[PDB]
Amino acid sequence: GTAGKVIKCKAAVLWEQKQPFSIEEIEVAPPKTKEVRIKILATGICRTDDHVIKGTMVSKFPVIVGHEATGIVESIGEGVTTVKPGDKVIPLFLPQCRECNACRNPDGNLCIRSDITGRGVLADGTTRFTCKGKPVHHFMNTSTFTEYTVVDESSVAKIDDAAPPEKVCLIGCGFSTGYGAAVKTGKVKPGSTCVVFGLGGVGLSVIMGCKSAGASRIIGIDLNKDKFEKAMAVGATECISPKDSTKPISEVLSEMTGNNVGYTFEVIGHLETMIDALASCHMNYGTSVVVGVPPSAKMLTYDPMLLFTGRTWKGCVFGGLKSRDDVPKLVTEFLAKKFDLDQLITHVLPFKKISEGFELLNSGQSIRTVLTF
Amino acid sequence: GTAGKVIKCKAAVLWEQKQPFSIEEIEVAPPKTKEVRIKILATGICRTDDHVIKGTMVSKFPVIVGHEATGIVESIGEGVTTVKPGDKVIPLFLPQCRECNACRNPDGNLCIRSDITGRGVLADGTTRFTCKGKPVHHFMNTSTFTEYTVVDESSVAKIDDAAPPEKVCLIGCGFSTGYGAAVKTGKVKPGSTCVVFGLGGVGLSVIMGCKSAGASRIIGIDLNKDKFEKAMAVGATECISPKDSTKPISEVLSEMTGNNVGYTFEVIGHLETMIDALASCHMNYGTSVVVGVPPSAKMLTYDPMLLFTGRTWKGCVFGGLKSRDDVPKLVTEFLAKKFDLDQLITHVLPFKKISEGFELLNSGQSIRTVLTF
Numbered sequence A, B: 001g002t003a004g005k006v007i008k009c010k011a012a013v014l015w016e017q018k019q020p021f022s023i024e025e026i027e028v029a030p031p032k033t034k035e036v037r038i039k040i041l042a043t044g045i046c047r048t049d050d051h052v053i054k055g056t057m058v059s060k061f062p063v064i065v066g067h068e069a070t071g072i073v074e075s076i077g078e079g080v081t082t083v084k085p086g087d088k089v090i091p092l093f094l095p096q097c098r099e100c101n102a103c104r105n106p107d108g109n110l111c112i113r114s115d116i117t118g119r120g121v122l123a124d125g126t127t128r129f130t131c132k133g134k135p136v137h138h139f140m141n142t143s144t145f146t147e148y149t150v151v152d153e154s155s156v157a158k159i160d161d162a163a164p165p166e167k168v169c170l171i172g173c174g175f176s177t178g179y180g181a182a183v184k185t186g187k188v189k190p191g192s193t194c195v196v197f198g199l200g201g202v203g204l205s206v207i208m209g210c211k212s213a214g215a216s217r218i219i220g221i222d223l224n225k226d227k228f229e230k231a232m233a234v235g236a237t238e239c240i241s242p243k244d245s246t247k248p249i250s251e252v253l254s255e256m257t258g259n260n261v262g263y264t265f266e267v268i269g270h271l272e273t274m275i276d277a278l279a280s281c282h283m284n285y286g287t288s289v290v291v292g293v294p295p296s297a298k299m300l301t302y303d304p305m306l307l308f309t310g311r312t313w314k315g316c317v318f319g320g321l322k323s324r325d326d327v328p329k330l331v332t333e334f335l336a337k338k339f340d341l342d343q344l345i346t347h348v349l350p351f352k353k354i355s356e357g358f359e360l361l362n363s364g365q366s367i368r369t370v371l372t373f
């Protein structure tokens, strides 16, 4: 078997920033203590991965990004008790050590293992993939744009065998974040009026969340009018584009709802919309959840009076879900015909066609692209 | 009687900003439809009143400030049905029409009638005071540094007759704000560790709030060490001064609590301290309530990652209390010996000694000074 020896395989390595991917043969060192080596079956293309290339999100290069996926367990390391080889799992970019401060805190989730610093290694303070002698860095405790990867046990959730790898892979980042941001983070209330800024893969996920919450009205806001039709299929009661009017978006939504915007979700990644998403929620009882990651090295400049009058402004990391616990239950839900992930997946391509997936994304012609292996 | 005629009396008029008060003979007009003319018995000095004179709070001039008070109803206009002359009432700077959007929403309170914009006038766009021919503007739908004042029915809470005026007047701003800030707005959890930025009159009220919540550890932060003693009496577990160490406060409180600071309240009004208060709470599950009023026309500049990690940031007005409903309830709790409001009252001076009251505060030698008539 391979269990115990260096594996050689294909990987969409990224040598520099703003540089294109190049599929290359790498050396997946076998798992160490409490580590697991996974064989990736399917991996989706999320906006975060695209951020790395553009420079909007820093990382150590060379890197093997990707984090939204699902695979089978090839071999487990020393001590691995939660999963055995053959098990269907989903790597988790947000760990759940079950011992750290937040992991202990019922209203927390950002484990101490989490890598939002751009460390590019595992707990061991080291890398598993090699290439041309050169070591290559991990991405957010995961790295799924590769045939095989190694993740700490703290980053592995075991899901149902019946789960179709192409659909459930969305649950590793896109759907769990969006859905949770509405249901968990913002705790949308039945009857409220939600408005989503960004009709992307994660945005539509929130729309679904609001739909499960019972939101009476859901307004989809997006620059690309071609997204509306799908947003509405998912649950949007109406959508609009910021350019439809010359008067501020906050005044638009204000007059549209009758100054009743109860919730607002920023799922884009721009400072400006982080502010008009805030402003667009009711000055007193409106909540504005920031789901999109702000551009690296940028500082937001705002009017405190927006917050002072009573606004609740909260951040969101993986829908505030506790990965090792929620990922499993969420997958069961999908199988329970609760929701339809099919409506988010617009393109399924083979890994070799990874550049087509990305471009289709930047072209605004694909919600979620699934790269199957 | 007076009921129906213009009253003449003394009031602490402020002709210009940066200018000293000036006790003068004013003419308080009789109340119009659904308005109430009240005779002020006691009025405390809030830091907000001081903001007006310093310019950090925009208001039209001339203006009769003051809003933390209690008095008795002298005459009621037509339609007034909630109160009758003789009644002991508390003027409300934050109205409660019971019909606007915020009023009808359970988790809101900033009623549409509020004057957070500096209008300086009653619902009918007019002012009741006059002085040397010249019109004098109200302050926050109240204006209490006068022997008499006129307010709209939506800004009048009918209290318990037995309530002592120079004590329950704190429930009109100071105590209601601070207490509600921790109990209602921030909903402090039993066992939590809270930190208070500012040990003034409102700050101390927050400590009493957290203490009521069951906060296992409360840390008071103030740069004026002489207030600590009072804080500790109020409920503080320990106090610190930002100057006591060179290592930024956020790192200090973290080392102090083992990165378990769950709640933070900014009760001072400085942009820099608002930042320090955000950073000071747990990056994933920490809440940071802003109670201080941010300086006029100034923007806040911070790092969005602080919020993105999961922190809750919320503003606070009147401790999130629904005025006409909560103020009465609060007073009774007071008479029921629930809280010791006397621990906040450091001075009681006659109205004409107002300037000393303000000096007392600016010299950091008084928590809450009550100016009695």
Ligand SMILES: NC(=O)c1ccc[n+]([C@@H]2O[C@H](COP(=O)([O-])OP(=O)(O)OC[C@H]3O[C@@H](n4cnc5c(N)ncnc54)[C@H](O)[C@@H]3O)[C@@H](O)[C@H]2O)c1
Binding pocket: A046, A047, A048, A051, A173, A174, A177, A197, A198, A199, A200, A201, A202, A203, A221, A222, A223, A224, A227, A242, A267, A268, A269, A270, A273, A291, A292, A293, A294, A316, A317, A318, A319, A364, A367
């Ligand atoms: N915090 C998290 O857990 C988390 C999870 C997933 C994704 N993200 C972040 O979410 C954001 C987007 O992710 P996605 O995967 O859903 O991407 P996506 O590309 O599919 O969607 C981007 C959406 O934003 C719209 N948009 C961009 N600029 C706009 C503007 N100026 N005004 C209005 N609309 C505009 C696009 O048209 C599209 O509708 C990024 O910040 C990504 O890093 C965060």
Ligand SMILES: NC(=O)c1ccc[n+]([C@@H]2O[C@H](COP(=O)([O-])OP(=O)(O)OC[C@H]3O[C@@H](n4cnc5c(N)ncnc54)[C@H](O)[C@@H]3O)[C@@H](O)[C@H]2O)c1
Binding pocket: B046, B047, B048, B051, B173, B174, B177, B197, B198, B199, B200, B201, B202, B203, B221, B222, B223, B224, B227, B242, B267, B268, B269, B270, B273, B290, B291, B292, B293, B316, B317, B318, B319, B364, B367
């Ligand atoms: N939002 C509201 O509903 C509401 C209600 C009442 C009062 N307020 C605001 O309350 C805020 C606090 O004022 P207050 O009424 O309690 O009176 P205050 O002036 O006495 O409180 C200031 C307190 O904070 C301390 N302080 C001042 N600058 C500081 C700094 N740089 N670093 C650390 N500590 C500092 C002072 O020593 C004092 O203890 C004011 O800004 C006032 O506008 C707001």
Ligand SMILES: [Zn+2]
Binding pocket: A046, A047, A048, A049, A067, A068, A173, A174
């Ligand atoms: Zn992602």
Ligand SMILES: [Zn+2]
Binding pocket: A095, A096, A097, A098, A099, A100, A101, A102, A103, A104, A110, A111, A112, A113
């Ligand atoms: Zn953890």
Ligand SMILES: [Zn+2]
Binding pocket: A270
């Ligand atoms: Zn954009």
Ligand SMILES: [Zn+2]
Binding pocket: B046, B047, B048, B049, B067, B068, B173, B174
């Ligand atoms: Zn006040």
Ligand SMILES: [Zn+2]
Binding pocket: B060, B061, B062, B135, B137
């Ligand atoms: Zn005027």
Ligand SMILES: [Zn+2]
Binding pocket: B095, B096, B097, B098, B099, B100, B101, B102, B103, B110, B111, B112, B113
């Ligand atoms: Zn109202």
Ligand SMILES: [Zn+2]
Binding pocket: B268, B270
């Ligand atoms: Zn100060």
Ligand SMILES: [Zn+2]
Binding pocket: B340, B342, B343
């Ligand atoms: Zn006492």
